[PDB]
Amino acid sequence: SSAVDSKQNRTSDFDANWKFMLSDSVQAQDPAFDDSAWQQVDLPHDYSITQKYSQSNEAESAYLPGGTGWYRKSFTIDRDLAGKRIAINFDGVYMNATVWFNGVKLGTHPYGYSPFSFDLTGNAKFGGENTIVVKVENRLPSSRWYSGSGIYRDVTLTVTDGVHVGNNGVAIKTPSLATQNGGNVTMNLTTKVANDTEAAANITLKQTVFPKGGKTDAAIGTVTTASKSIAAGASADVTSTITAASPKLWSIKNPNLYTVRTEVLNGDTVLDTYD
Amino acid sequence: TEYGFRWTGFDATSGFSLNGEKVKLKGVSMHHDQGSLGAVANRRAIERQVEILQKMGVNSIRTTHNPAAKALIDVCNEKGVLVVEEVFDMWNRSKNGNTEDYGKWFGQTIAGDNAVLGGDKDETWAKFDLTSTINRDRNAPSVIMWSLGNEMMEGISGSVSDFPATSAKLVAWTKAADSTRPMTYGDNKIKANWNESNTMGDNLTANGGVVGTNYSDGANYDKIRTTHPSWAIYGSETASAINSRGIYNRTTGSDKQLTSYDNSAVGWGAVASSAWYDVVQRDFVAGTYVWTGFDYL
Numbered sequence: 152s153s154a155v156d157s158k159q160n161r162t163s164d165f166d167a168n169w170k171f172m173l174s175d176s177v178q179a180q181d182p183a184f185d186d187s188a189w190q191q192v193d194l195p196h197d198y199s200i201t202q203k204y205s206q207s208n209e210a211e212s213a214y215l216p217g218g219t220g221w222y223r224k225s226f227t228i229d230r231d232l233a234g235k236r237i238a239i240n241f242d243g244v245y246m247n248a249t250v251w252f253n254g255v256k257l258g259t260h261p262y263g264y265s266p267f268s269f270d271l272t273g274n275a276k277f278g279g280e281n282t283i284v285v286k287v288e289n290r291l292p293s294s295r296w297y298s299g300s301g302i303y304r305d306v307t308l309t310v311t312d313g314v315h316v317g318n319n320g321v322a323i324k325t326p327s328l329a330t331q332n333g334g335n336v337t338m339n340l341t342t343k344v345a346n347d348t349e350a351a352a353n354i355t356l357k358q359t360v361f362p363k364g365g366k367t368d369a370a371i372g373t374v375t376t377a378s379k380s381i382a383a384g385a386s387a388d389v390t391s392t393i394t395a396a397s398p399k400l401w402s403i404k405n406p407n408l409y410t411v412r413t414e415v416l417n418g419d420t421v422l423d424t425y426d
Numbered sequence: 427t428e429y430g431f432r433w434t435g436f437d438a439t440s441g442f443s444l445n446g447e448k449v450k451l452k453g454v455s456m457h458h459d460q461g462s463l464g465a466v467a468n469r470r471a472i473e474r475q476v477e478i479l480q481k482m483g484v485n486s487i488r489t490t491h492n493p494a495a496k497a498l499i500d501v502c503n504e505k506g507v508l509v510v511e512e513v514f515d516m517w518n519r520s521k522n523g524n525t526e527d528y529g530k531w532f533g534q535t536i537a538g539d540n541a542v543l544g545g546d547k548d549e550t551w552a553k554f555d556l557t558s559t560i561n562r563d564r565n566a567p568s569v570i571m572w573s574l575g576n577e578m579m580e581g582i583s584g585s586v587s588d589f590p591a592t593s594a595k596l597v598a599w600t601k602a603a604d605s606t607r608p609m610t611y612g613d614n615k616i617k618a619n620w621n622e623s624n625t626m627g628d629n630l631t632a633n634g635g636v637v638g639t640n641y642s643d644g645a646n647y648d649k650i651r652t653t654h655p656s657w658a659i660y661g662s663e664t665a666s667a668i669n670s671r672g673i674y675n676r677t678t679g680s681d682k683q684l685t686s687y688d689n690s691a692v693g694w695g696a697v698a699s700s701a702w703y704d705v706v707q708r709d710f711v712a713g714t715y716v717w718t719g720f721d722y723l
């Protein structure tokens with residue numbers, strides 16, 4: 152993005168328009184830091200692959216250096232996102248990442264291969280300029296094979312209402328599929344719903360299963376849950392059951408895929424839609 | 427005395443209505459000067475403005491930020507333009523380092539031997555000038571609301587603690603002077619959810635009034651609606667897009683001019699398309715008074 156506003160998709164591509172610097176001495180977490188001489192890069196990005204081979208490194212990891220890399224992105228958050236929640240998602244950063252937002256340190260993450268996230272909501276400037284900073288420290292030797300260094304996987308922003316399905320918040324089980332195959336198939340779902348508002352919510356879920364790509368007219372099962380009160384600042388696991396009418400199996404020769412959509416209602420209105 | 431038969435309504439959910447018909451307030455804010463003529467309130471000059479405004483589709487004028495000349499009231503009466511007559515800009519605190527503005531006089535008493543006439547003289551100048559305007563225009567069909575201030579807490583020095591009590595005083599003076607019209611103001615601190623603004627807006631509404639928010643966007647209109655379900659609201663000052671006439675060699679905002687493309691607005695405002703889009707989608711936003719309809723000195 153260069154600007155974040157409604158209505159990008161709930162989860163949107165955040166790969167573009169970053170700035171990069173390789174330096175183990177620079178301290179560039181302040182939003183007012185001058186990065187005008189830094190490289191402009193789009194992610195995903197690997198800063199080992201651009202450096203030279205050297206006999207001082209290790210054969211194990213392709214004789215390529217790692218090092219300390221800094222990534223900066225400055226972007227606007229429009230006033231129209233004012234009461235929304237904002238998170239940034241990393242599918243992977245290798246390795247030892249440190250994240251700041253508008254000058255505030257959010258946290259860290261060592262492992263170069265697992266996905267992680269940070270809530271940005273509490274530090275966001277709505278209707279202003281914002282700066283996210285990621286420091287990466289691939290200090291060698293850290294690998295038995297070529298790892299690479301930096302933000303080498305996609306990055307997204309997630310924007311939601313105060314009432315919303317949690318991060319990766321739906322689990323689906325079909326424990327009797329082998330027996331029920333070809334007939335009504337029992338889907339047992341669990342959905343984490345978070346109420347990040349200052350009032351209790353009366354929550355029902357409307358969950359639909361339909362062929363990927365794919366409209367809800369062609370659903371093979373739906374359910375609406377009974378109303379459950381979730382208190383302000385609290386979350387709850389919401390169990391639900393979908394009866395799927397003869398779903399098509401996912402097999403090697405015919406990998407049928409479905410979308411399982413969760414609409415979160417509070418009072419009578421939809422506040423969040425999670426696929 | 428000139429008279430016209432009409433009634434109005436402001437609804438928290440569905441907005442404004444005239445004689446039982448729902449109507450959008452498609453308005454502009456207008457300052458008083460007449461361009462190359464300076465401040466002179468010449469009748470044809472004022473009428474010409476209203477004519478040009480009407481050809482744009484305007485149906486309402488906010489007299490920012492002070493009483494209109496009687497000539498404007500006359501003209502709107504004959505032409506069918508709805509007037510929000512504003513009485514004040516600042517209250518008892520001066521703005522922008524203007525040590526001789528009405529902020530100096532607002533809360534001063536009136537000498538016993540001062541024979542000046544037009545409104546009540548038993549309290550402060552603010553009461554005299556408020557009543558005097560209402561006395562002049564109370565029968566005019568065009569005037570549909572009295573506005574009691576604009577951004578009263580902006581550009582001033584010191585605490586804003588006494589402002590909620592001052593607002594209530596003005597609201598009481600108005601209701602007692604004319605029971606037949608809602609009173610209102612334009613507050614720019616609503617978008618910032620100031621404590622004083624909530625108190626003041628709640629007092630407006632309790633006395634049959636309507637709350638004007640300066641420079642809210644769609645997201646903020648929505649927050650107001652959810653936070654204050656009882657308020658009947660409208661955009662009292664909107665857009666503040668900044669443009670020159672006839673400038674095309676850039677589409678964004680050397681010659682001391684600005685682009686004529688609608689891609690240029692002050693930091694606190696919005697371009698014209700944006701301020702309109704945000705309002706026209708919302709029945710609960712009664713309308714908009716665009717800053718401004720005519721350029722001013």
Ligand code: NA
Pocket residue numbers: 459460461720721722723
């Ligand atoms: Na003018």
